[PDB]
Structures are given as C-alpha cells and as structure tokens.
Amino acid sequence: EFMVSLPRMVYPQPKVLTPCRKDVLVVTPWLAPIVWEGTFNIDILNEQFRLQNTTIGLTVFAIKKYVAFLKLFLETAEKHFMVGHRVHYYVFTDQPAAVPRVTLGTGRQLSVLEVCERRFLSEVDYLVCVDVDMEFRDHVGVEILTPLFGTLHPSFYGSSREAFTYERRPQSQAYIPKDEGDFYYMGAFFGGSVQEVQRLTRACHQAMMVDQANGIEAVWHDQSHLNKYLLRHKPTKVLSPEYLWDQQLLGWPAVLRKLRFTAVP
Ligand SMILES: [Hg+2]
Ligand SMILES: [Hg+2]
Ligand SMILES: [Hg+2]
Ligand SMILES: [Hg+2]
C-alpha cells in the first residue's frame, strides 16, 4: 500500500472541457471507469503498476478438446497481455502432458494444475479469469486492474435490460427482475484482486448449490450467477467489448477502436 512518487513524464495535458468519448459511456453511475481506447494513458498506468511490482495471475481451464486452444492462447498472451509486468499463467487441465511448450518472456511463468486455494494469495496480486478458446489481438494491460471487474457481453452492450438474458425465474438465486440490472457481463473475462475474485467464486458456488438443492439450474449457468453477483457488488471497473469480441459474429463496429481479445474462428 505505500506508493513511491512517479518520475517526471511528458504527455498531453488532460482537457477538462473536452469529453473523452462522445459516442460511449466512460463511467458507471457508481463512478467506476468503463475501459475504452482513448480513456487511459498506458504510460502513466504502467508506471503506477510497475512501481508496485505488480504480479498478474491469468487462469484458464482447458478440458478435453479445449487443450487444442492453448498454443494460440498462450502465444498471443505473450504478445499482448501485461507485457512488461510479472505474469503467472495457471492452466487447469485434465491433460497435463498435452499442454504445449510455449516460450515465455522474462518474468513470466506457467503452472499446470491437473484436475480457490491460498497459493494465489501468496503468488499474485490480481487474478484474471478467461476462456481458453480465444486469442489476443491487441494490448490487454494494466488498465483493467482494479479490485473487481466484469466485461460487457459483446452481443448485449447496446441492449436494454429487459432484453438481457439474465436468470428470470424467481426460484433461482441468480434471479434478476426486468426492472433491475446495470449491464450484461460475460463469464468469459472477469477478475480483480485475489481476495475479490475468491469472494465472487465462493458466492457463485454457494448460490449454484442452493439452486441444485431446489432442483433448478440457471439459464446460462455460471454467467447468470456472475451477473447476479455483479448487480449486488458493483465492479470497480467495467471493461468494454474491446476486451471480449467475436469478429465473425459481430464484425468491427466504429465504436471499437481496437479488438483486443477475441473468439477463435
Ligand atoms: Hg480521453
Ligand atoms: Hg479464476
Ligand atoms: Hg453469484
Ligand atoms: Hg460466478
């Protein structure tokens, strides 16, 4: 928590009387930034995070045929994910011997765990939880780091809340009525401090057990419960769909200046 001074740095003065974006919302109503290209100066942010010796954990589950996605996923993470910072990849897999041997940059490591415990608390400062059937195509960096973040679902970012595919059955712990909801977050990319991520996954797991005891299974299971949690425990940042895109399904709209992390065709 003690933070050394930034060095002198030369960059454009912020413009108080020029909006950052005129096409999109860049702050939530609980004053959490919404991360779009143009909002952040990455040099400032990199300094702040490097001066804290920040370590980022990146977790992926790769079960059965999903092991095939690891090579592209890790290679492209090496090009685009937290470059310059300490990174610890945790690959959770039923096929440890099939994990590809990917060459890592300095300060980057990978653990294979055969299939949250406290090993994370001792090893990393932040945890980022993503799906493996994806590739990085542009910068994903410390601009996302915060106590708790969710990402806007790319199919729903323009939708009204009544059209969100939340769990709508009142018998479910994930239940959200039609007049509630900020955003529709996708399960494929969330994170935060280790403490906040473990709170979330603990809460989701308990709610999911309660539903199962009541003989009910939520519509988009993990994602429905994620959405309920983030409704009731507001994220400290929200990532734009730059951070979770499918170009084959959704193209490349003007509102996206960059496509950073995308579905594999
Ligand atoms: Hg700006
Ligand atoms: Hg995780
Ligand atoms: Hg939950
Ligand atoms: Hg969850």
PDB file of C-alpha atoms in Angstrom, residues 20-258:
ATOM      1  CA  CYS A  20     -13.072  11.765 -23.611  1.00  0.00           C
ATOM      2  CA  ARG A  21     -15.517   9.938 -25.921  1.00  0.00           C
ATOM      3  CA  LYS A  22     -18.761  11.380 -27.371  1.00  0.00           C
ATOM      4  CA  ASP A  23     -20.020   8.009 -28.520  1.00  0.00           C
ATOM      5  CA  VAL A  24     -19.850   5.920 -25.346  1.00  0.00           C
ATOM      6  CA  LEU A  25     -20.261   5.968 -21.579  1.00  0.00           C
ATOM      7  CA  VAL A  26     -16.878   6.028 -19.845  1.00  0.00           C
ATOM      8  CA  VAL A  27     -18.031   5.957 -16.182  1.00  0.00           C
ATOM      9  CA  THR A  28     -20.736   3.938 -14.445  1.00  0.00           C
ATOM     10  CA  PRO A  29     -23.252   5.584 -12.067  1.00  0.00           C
ATOM     11  CA  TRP A  30     -21.191   4.300  -9.089  1.00  0.00           C
ATOM     12  CA  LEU A  31     -18.140   6.080 -10.546  1.00  0.00           C
ATOM     13  CA  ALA A  32     -16.256   3.030 -11.874  1.00  0.00           C
ATOM     14  CA  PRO A  33     -14.405   3.677 -15.136  1.00  0.00           C
ATOM     15  CA  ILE A  34     -15.598   1.870 -18.291  1.00  0.00           C
ATOM     16  CA  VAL A  35     -12.408   0.977 -20.148  1.00  0.00           C
ATOM     17  CA  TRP A  36     -12.431   2.020 -23.799  1.00  0.00           C
ATOM     18  CA  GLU A  37      -9.494   3.021 -26.006  1.00  0.00           C
ATOM     19  CA  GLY A  38      -8.812   6.801 -25.544  1.00  0.00           C
ATOM     20  CA  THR A  39      -9.749   6.757 -21.816  1.00  0.00           C
ATOM     21  CA  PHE A  40      -6.317   5.857 -20.499  1.00  0.00           C
ATOM     22  CA  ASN A  41      -2.727   6.855 -20.886  1.00  0.00           C
ATOM     23  CA  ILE A  42      -0.940   3.477 -20.660  1.00  0.00           C
ATOM     24  CA  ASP A  43       2.428   5.030 -19.825  1.00  0.00           C
ATOM     25  CA  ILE A  44       1.079   6.563 -16.621  1.00  0.00           C
ATOM     26  CA  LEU A  45      -0.684   3.369 -15.680  1.00  0.00           C
ATOM     27  CA  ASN A  46       2.342   1.188 -16.457  1.00  0.00           C
ATOM     28  CA  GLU A  47       4.474   3.351 -14.159  1.00  0.00           C
ATOM     29  CA  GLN A  48       1.938   3.144 -11.334  1.00  0.00           C
ATOM     30  CA  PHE A  49       1.745  -0.633 -11.577  1.00  0.00           C
ATOM     31  CA  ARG A  50       5.436  -1.361 -12.139  1.00  0.00           C
ATOM     32  CA  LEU A  51       6.317   0.785  -9.156  1.00  0.00           C
ATOM     33  CA  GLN A  52       4.142  -1.571  -7.059  1.00  0.00           C
ATOM     34  CA  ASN A  53       5.909  -4.663  -8.557  1.00  0.00           C
ATOM     35  CA  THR A  54       2.533  -5.913  -9.692  1.00  0.00           C
ATOM     36  CA  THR A  55       2.078  -9.592 -10.402  1.00  0.00           C
ATOM     37  CA  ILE A  56      -0.884 -10.741 -12.527  1.00  0.00           C
ATOM     38  CA  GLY A  57      -2.262 -14.267 -12.454  1.00  0.00           C
ATOM     39  CA  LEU A  58      -4.074 -15.438 -15.639  1.00  0.00           C
ATOM     40  CA  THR A  59      -6.245 -18.566 -15.125  1.00  0.00           C
ATOM     41  CA  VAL A  60      -7.688 -20.800 -17.900  1.00  0.00           C
ATOM     42  CA  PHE A  61      -9.463 -24.182 -17.797  1.00  0.00           C
ATOM     43  CA  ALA A  62      -8.635 -26.381 -20.745  1.00  0.00           C
ATOM     44  CA  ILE A  63     -10.583 -29.686 -20.544  1.00  0.00           C
ATOM     45  CA  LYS A  64     -10.867 -32.458 -23.163  1.00  0.00           C
ATOM     46  CA  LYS A  65     -10.707 -30.971 -26.706  1.00  0.00           C
ATOM     47  CA  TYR A  66     -10.181 -27.417 -25.374  1.00  0.00           C
ATOM     48  CA  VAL A  67      -6.461 -28.267 -24.878  1.00  0.00           C
ATOM     49  CA  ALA A  68      -6.062 -27.664 -28.598  1.00  0.00           C
ATOM     50  CA  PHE A  69      -6.656 -23.906 -27.972  1.00  0.00           C
ATOM     51  CA  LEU A  70      -3.734 -23.476 -25.520  1.00  0.00           C
ATOM     52  CA  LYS A  71      -0.924 -22.918 -28.003  1.00  0.00           C
ATOM     53  CA  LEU A  72      -2.561 -19.844 -29.756  1.00  0.00           C
ATOM     54  CA  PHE A  73      -3.954 -18.564 -26.458  1.00  0.00           C
ATOM     55  CA  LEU A  74      -0.532 -18.562 -24.721  1.00  0.00           C
ATOM     56  CA  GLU A  75       1.426 -17.365 -27.737  1.00  0.00           C
ATOM     57  CA  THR A  76      -0.860 -14.397 -28.240  1.00  0.00           C
ATOM     58  CA  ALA A  77      -0.925 -13.646 -24.473  1.00  0.00           C
ATOM     59  CA  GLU A  78       2.845 -13.418 -24.688  1.00  0.00           C
ATOM     60  CA  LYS A  79       2.474 -10.732 -27.383  1.00  0.00           C
ATOM     61  CA  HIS A  80      -0.326  -8.695 -25.834  1.00  0.00           C
ATOM     62  CA  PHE A  81      -1.147  -9.492 -22.171  1.00  0.00           C
ATOM     63  CA  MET A  82       0.506  -7.442 -19.443  1.00  0.00           C
ATOM     64  CA  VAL A  83       3.791  -7.197 -21.391  1.00  0.00           C
ATOM     65  CA  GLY A  84       6.453  -5.626 -19.117  1.00  0.00           C
ATOM     66  CA  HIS A  85       4.788  -6.922 -15.939  1.00  0.00           C
ATOM     67  CA  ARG A  86       5.137 -10.125 -13.940  1.00  0.00           C
ATOM     68  CA  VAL A  87       2.660 -12.738 -15.201  1.00  0.00           C
ATOM     69  CA  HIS A  88       1.804 -16.173 -13.773  1.00  0.00           C
ATOM     70  CA  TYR A  89      -0.339 -18.371 -16.027  1.00  0.00           C
ATOM     71  CA  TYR A  90      -2.305 -21.097 -14.329  1.00  0.00           C
ATOM     72  CA  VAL A  91      -3.567 -23.743 -16.745  1.00  0.00           C
ATOM     73  CA  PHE A  92      -6.165 -26.096 -15.228  1.00  0.00           C
ATOM     74  CA  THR A  93      -6.374 -29.182 -17.374  1.00  0.00           C
ATOM     75  CA  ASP A  94      -7.327 -32.904 -17.451  1.00  0.00           C
ATOM     76  CA  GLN A  95      -4.366 -33.477 -19.845  1.00  0.00           C
ATOM     77  CA  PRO A  96      -1.181 -32.059 -18.332  1.00  0.00           C
ATOM     78  CA  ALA A  97       1.034 -33.845 -20.885  1.00  0.00           C
ATOM     79  CA  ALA A  98      -0.800 -32.197 -23.766  1.00  0.00           C
ATOM     80  CA  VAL A  99      -0.086 -28.580 -22.662  1.00  0.00           C
ATOM     81  CA  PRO A 100       2.097 -27.097 -25.440  1.00  0.00           C
ATOM     82  CA  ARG A 101       5.632 -25.922 -24.695  1.00  0.00           C
ATOM     83  CA  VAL A 102       5.276 -22.177 -25.306  1.00  0.00           C
ATOM     84  CA  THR A 103       8.269 -19.897 -24.984  1.00  0.00           C
ATOM     85  CA  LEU A 104       7.733 -17.186 -22.347  1.00  0.00           C
ATOM     86  CA  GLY A 105       9.184 -13.707 -21.893  1.00  0.00           C
ATOM     87  CA  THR A 106      11.260 -12.919 -18.856  1.00  0.00           C
ATOM     88  CA  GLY A 107       9.283 -12.507 -15.632  1.00  0.00           C
ATOM     89  CA  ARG A 108       6.527 -14.801 -16.915  1.00  0.00           C
ATOM     90  CA  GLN A 109       5.756 -18.273 -15.663  1.00  0.00           C
ATOM     91  CA  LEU A 110       3.278 -21.016 -16.193  1.00  0.00           C
ATOM     92  CA  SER A 111       1.915 -23.628 -13.775  1.00  0.00           C
ATOM     93  CA  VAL A 112      -0.014 -26.692 -14.969  1.00  0.00           C
ATOM     94  CA  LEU A 113      -2.551 -27.964 -12.428  1.00  0.00           C
ATOM     95  CA  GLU A 114      -4.259 -31.241 -13.142  1.00  0.00           C
ATOM     96  CA  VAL A 115      -7.992 -31.505 -12.472  1.00  0.00           C
ATOM     97  CA  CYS A 116      -9.759 -21.028  -4.683  1.00  0.00           C
ATOM     98  CA  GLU A 117      -6.799 -22.294  -2.542  1.00  0.00           C
ATOM     99  CA  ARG A 118      -4.408 -19.792  -0.928  1.00  0.00           C
ATOM    100  CA  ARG A 119      -1.481 -20.425  -3.312  1.00  0.00           C
ATOM    101  CA  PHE A 120      -2.891 -17.437  -5.287  1.00  0.00           C
ATOM    102  CA  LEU A 121      -2.822 -15.120  -2.312  1.00  0.00           C
ATOM    103  CA  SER A 122       0.891 -15.680  -1.848  1.00  0.00           C
ATOM    104  CA  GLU A 123       1.767 -15.592  -5.533  1.00  0.00           C
ATOM    105  CA  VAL A 124      -0.165 -12.922  -7.355  1.00  0.00           C
ATOM    106  CA  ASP A 125      -1.742  -9.505  -6.691  1.00  0.00           C
ATOM    107  CA  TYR A 126      -4.548  -9.775  -9.285  1.00  0.00           C
ATOM    108  CA  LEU A 127      -6.383 -12.693 -10.885  1.00  0.00           C
ATOM    109  CA  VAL A 128      -7.768 -12.616 -14.361  1.00  0.00           C
ATOM    110  CA  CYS A 129     -10.126 -15.463 -15.329  1.00  0.00           C
ATOM    111  CA  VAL A 130     -10.704 -16.113 -19.042  1.00  0.00           C
ATOM    112  CA  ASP A 131     -11.830 -18.765 -21.520  1.00  0.00           C
ATOM    113  CA  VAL A 132      -9.063 -20.603 -23.452  1.00  0.00           C
ATOM    114  CA  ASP A 133     -10.848 -20.694 -26.864  1.00  0.00           C
ATOM    115  CA  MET A 134      -9.769 -17.102 -27.536  1.00  0.00           C
ATOM    116  CA  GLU A 135      -6.800 -15.161 -28.828  1.00  0.00           C
ATOM    117  CA  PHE A 136      -5.243 -11.843 -28.005  1.00  0.00           C
ATOM    118  CA  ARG A 137      -5.058  -9.487 -30.990  1.00  0.00           C
ATOM    119  CA  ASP A 138      -4.145  -6.195 -29.276  1.00  0.00           C
ATOM    120  CA  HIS A 139      -2.979  -4.728 -25.970  1.00  0.00           C
ATOM    121  CA  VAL A 140      -4.618  -6.026 -22.760  1.00  0.00           C
ATOM    122  CA  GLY A 141      -2.770  -4.422 -19.919  1.00  0.00           C
ATOM    123  CA  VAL A 142      -2.852  -2.882 -16.516  1.00  0.00           C
ATOM    124  CA  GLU A 143      -5.717  -0.546 -17.434  1.00  0.00           C
ATOM    125  CA  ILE A 144      -8.025  -3.433 -16.479  1.00  0.00           C
ATOM    126  CA  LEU A 145      -6.626  -3.940 -12.957  1.00  0.00           C
ATOM    127  CA  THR A 146      -8.820  -2.971 -10.021  1.00  0.00           C
ATOM    128  CA  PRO A 147     -10.381  -4.720  -7.062  1.00  0.00           C
ATOM    129  CA  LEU A 148     -13.217  -6.216  -9.102  1.00  0.00           C
ATOM    130  CA  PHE A 149     -14.019  -6.078 -12.839  1.00  0.00           C
ATOM    131  CA  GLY A 150     -16.525  -7.515 -15.275  1.00  0.00           C
ATOM    132  CA  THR A 151     -16.627  -7.210 -19.053  1.00  0.00           C
ATOM    133  CA  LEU A 152     -19.555  -6.176 -21.246  1.00  0.00           C
ATOM    134  CA  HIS A 153     -21.038  -9.054 -23.181  1.00  0.00           C
ATOM    135  CA  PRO A 154     -20.415  -8.220 -26.862  1.00  0.00           C
ATOM    136  CA  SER A 155     -23.892  -9.327 -28.010  1.00  0.00           C
ATOM    137  CA  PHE A 156     -25.671  -7.160 -25.455  1.00  0.00           C
ATOM    138  CA  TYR A 157     -23.788  -3.915 -24.897  1.00  0.00           C
ATOM    139  CA  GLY A 158     -26.444  -1.887 -26.786  1.00  0.00           C
ATOM    140  CA  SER A 159     -29.444  -3.787 -25.405  1.00  0.00           C
ATOM    141  CA  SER A 160     -31.960  -2.561 -22.876  1.00  0.00           C
ATOM    142  CA  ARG A 161     -32.060  -4.538 -19.625  1.00  0.00           C
ATOM    143  CA  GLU A 162     -35.357  -6.257 -20.369  1.00  0.00           C
ATOM    144  CA  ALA A 163     -33.532  -7.972 -23.342  1.00  0.00           C
ATOM    145  CA  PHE A 164     -30.620  -9.194 -21.192  1.00  0.00           C
ATOM    146  CA  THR A 165     -30.677 -12.971 -20.847  1.00  0.00           C
ATOM    147  CA  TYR A 166     -30.444 -12.838 -17.021  1.00  0.00           C
ATOM    148  CA  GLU A 167     -31.978 -15.683 -14.991  1.00  0.00           C
ATOM    149  CA  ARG A 168     -35.677 -14.670 -14.879  1.00  0.00           C
ATOM    150  CA  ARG A 169     -37.153 -17.405 -12.620  1.00  0.00           C
ATOM    151  CA  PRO A 170     -37.730 -16.139  -9.045  1.00  0.00           C
ATOM    152  CA  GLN A 171     -36.934 -19.626  -7.670  1.00  0.00           C
ATOM    153  CA  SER A 172     -33.273 -19.143  -8.724  1.00  0.00           C
ATOM    154  CA  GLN A 173     -30.667 -17.426  -6.547  1.00  0.00           C
ATOM    155  CA  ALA A 174     -29.454 -15.820  -9.861  1.00  0.00           C
ATOM    156  CA  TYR A 175     -32.878 -14.256 -10.425  1.00  0.00           C
ATOM    157  CA  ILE A 176     -32.913 -10.674 -11.720  1.00  0.00           C
ATOM    158  CA  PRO A 177     -36.264  -8.983 -12.451  1.00  0.00           C
ATOM    159  CA  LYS A 178     -36.934  -6.947 -15.555  1.00  0.00           C
ATOM    160  CA  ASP A 179     -36.600  -3.552 -13.820  1.00  0.00           C
ATOM    161  CA  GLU A 180     -33.113  -4.394 -12.404  1.00  0.00           C
ATOM    162  CA  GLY A 181     -29.640  -4.605 -13.959  1.00  0.00           C
ATOM    163  CA  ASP A 182     -26.809  -2.303 -14.979  1.00  0.00           C
ATOM    164  CA  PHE A 183     -25.114  -4.291 -17.703  1.00  0.00           C
ATOM    165  CA  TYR A 184     -24.911  -7.809 -19.039  1.00  0.00           C
ATOM    166  CA  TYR A 185     -21.451  -9.112 -18.194  1.00  0.00           C
ATOM    167  CA  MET A 186     -19.940 -12.161 -19.973  1.00  0.00           C
ATOM    168  CA  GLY A 187     -18.453 -15.024 -17.942  1.00  0.00           C
ATOM    169  CA  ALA A 188     -15.513 -15.329 -20.284  1.00  0.00           C
ATOM    170  CA  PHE A 189     -13.359 -12.451 -18.844  1.00  0.00           C
ATOM    171  CA  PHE A 190     -13.535 -11.195 -15.236  1.00  0.00           C
ATOM    172  CA  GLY A 191     -11.032 -10.573 -12.446  1.00  0.00           C
ATOM    173  CA  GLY A 192      -9.815  -8.412  -9.657  1.00  0.00           C
ATOM    174  CA  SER A 193      -7.709  -8.707  -6.534  1.00  0.00           C
ATOM    175  CA  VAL A 194      -7.279 -12.349  -5.425  1.00  0.00           C
ATOM    176  CA  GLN A 195      -9.498 -11.540  -2.398  1.00  0.00           C
ATOM    177  CA  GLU A 196     -12.287 -10.120  -4.529  1.00  0.00           C
ATOM    178  CA  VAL A 197     -12.139 -12.933  -7.102  1.00  0.00           C
ATOM    179  CA  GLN A 198     -12.274 -15.590  -4.375  1.00  0.00           C
ATOM    180  CA  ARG A 199     -15.293 -13.830  -2.785  1.00  0.00           C
ATOM    181  CA  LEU A 200     -17.028 -13.908  -6.101  1.00  0.00           C
ATOM    182  CA  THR A 201     -16.342 -17.541  -6.915  1.00  0.00           C
ATOM    183  CA  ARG A 202     -17.280 -18.596  -3.349  1.00  0.00           C
ATOM    184  CA  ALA A 203     -20.596 -16.706  -3.649  1.00  0.00           C
ATOM    185  CA  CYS A 204     -21.343 -18.143  -7.097  1.00  0.00           C
ATOM    186  CA  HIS A 205     -20.577 -21.690  -5.970  1.00  0.00           C
ATOM    187  CA  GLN A 206     -22.871 -21.395  -2.911  1.00  0.00           C
ATOM    188  CA  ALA A 207     -25.761 -19.919  -4.945  1.00  0.00           C
ATOM    189  CA  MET A 208     -25.314 -22.667  -7.586  1.00  0.00           C
ATOM    190  CA  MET A 209     -25.521 -25.358  -4.813  1.00  0.00           C
ATOM    191  CA  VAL A 210     -28.700 -23.748  -3.443  1.00  0.00           C
ATOM    192  CA  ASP A 211     -30.310 -23.852  -6.911  1.00  0.00           C
ATOM    193  CA  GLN A 212     -29.289 -27.506  -7.361  1.00  0.00           C
ATOM    194  CA  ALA A 213     -30.849 -28.367  -3.929  1.00  0.00           C
ATOM    195  CA  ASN A 214     -34.020 -26.624  -5.184  1.00  0.00           C
ATOM    196  CA  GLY A 215     -33.933 -28.642  -8.372  1.00  0.00           C
ATOM    197  CA  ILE A 216     -33.268 -25.634 -10.604  1.00  0.00           C
ATOM    198  CA  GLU A 217     -30.405 -24.865 -12.950  1.00  0.00           C
ATOM    199  CA  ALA A 218     -29.851 -21.230 -14.103  1.00  0.00           C
ATOM    200  CA  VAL A 219     -30.326 -20.445 -17.860  1.00  0.00           C
ATOM    201  CA  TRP A 220     -26.664 -19.534 -18.760  1.00  0.00           C
ATOM    202  CA  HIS A 221     -25.427 -21.141 -15.606  1.00  0.00           C
ATOM    203  CA  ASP A 222     -22.103 -19.588 -14.456  1.00  0.00           C
ATOM    204  CA  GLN A 223     -22.838 -16.332 -16.329  1.00  0.00           C
ATOM    205  CA  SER A 224     -26.288 -15.883 -14.741  1.00  0.00           C
ATOM    206  CA  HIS A 225     -24.788 -16.119 -11.240  1.00  0.00           C
ATOM    207  CA  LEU A 226     -21.881 -13.789 -12.233  1.00  0.00           C
ATOM    208  CA  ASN A 227     -24.473 -11.279 -13.350  1.00  0.00           C
ATOM    209  CA  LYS A 228     -26.354 -11.516 -10.060  1.00  0.00           C
ATOM    210  CA  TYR A 229     -23.172 -11.054  -8.045  1.00  0.00           C
ATOM    211  CA  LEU A 230     -22.082  -8.011 -10.067  1.00  0.00           C
ATOM    212  CA  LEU A 231     -25.513  -6.481  -9.700  1.00  0.00           C
ATOM    213  CA  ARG A 232     -25.276  -6.708  -5.909  1.00  0.00           C
ATOM    214  CA  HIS A 233     -21.492  -5.996  -5.620  1.00  0.00           C
ATOM    215  CA  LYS A 234     -20.706  -3.330  -8.163  1.00  0.00           C
ATOM    216  CA  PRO A 235     -17.461  -3.790 -10.129  1.00  0.00           C
ATOM    217  CA  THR A 236     -14.783  -1.173  -9.621  1.00  0.00           C
ATOM    218  CA  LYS A 237     -14.078  -1.169 -13.345  1.00  0.00           C
ATOM    219  CA  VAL A 238     -16.113  -2.376 -16.313  1.00  0.00           C
ATOM    220  CA  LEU A 239     -14.333  -3.469 -19.488  1.00  0.00           C
ATOM    221  CA  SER A 240     -15.782  -2.511 -22.868  1.00  0.00           C
ATOM    222  CA  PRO A 241     -16.354  -5.138 -25.541  1.00  0.00           C
ATOM    223  CA  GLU A 242     -12.947  -4.316 -26.974  1.00  0.00           C
ATOM    224  CA  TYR A 243     -11.901  -6.898 -24.293  1.00  0.00           C
ATOM    225  CA  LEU A 244     -14.277  -9.714 -25.372  1.00  0.00           C
ATOM    226  CA  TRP A 245     -15.247  -9.749 -29.071  1.00  0.00           C
ATOM    227  CA  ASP A 246     -16.273 -12.125 -31.892  1.00  0.00           C
ATOM    228  CA  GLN A 247     -15.496 -10.553 -35.190  1.00  0.00           C
ATOM    229  CA  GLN A 248     -17.059 -13.400 -37.253  1.00  0.00           C
ATOM    230  CA  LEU A 249     -20.354 -12.998 -35.375  1.00  0.00           C
ATOM    231  CA  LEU A 250     -20.295  -9.181 -34.841  1.00  0.00           C
ATOM    232  CA  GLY A 251     -17.950  -7.603 -37.334  1.00  0.00           C
ATOM    233  CA  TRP A 252     -15.946  -4.471 -36.396  1.00  0.00           C
ATOM    234  CA  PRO A 253     -18.213  -1.595 -35.400  1.00  0.00           C
ATOM    235  CA  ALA A 254     -16.996   2.025 -35.361  1.00  0.00           C
ATOM    236  CA  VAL A 255     -17.339   2.179 -31.548  1.00  0.00           C
ATOM    237  CA  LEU A 256     -14.476  -0.372 -31.256  1.00  0.00           C
ATOM    238  CA  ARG A 257     -11.151   1.316 -31.940  1.00  0.00           C
ATOM    239  CA  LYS A 258      -9.335  -1.864 -31.039  1.00  0.00           C
TER     240      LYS A 258
END
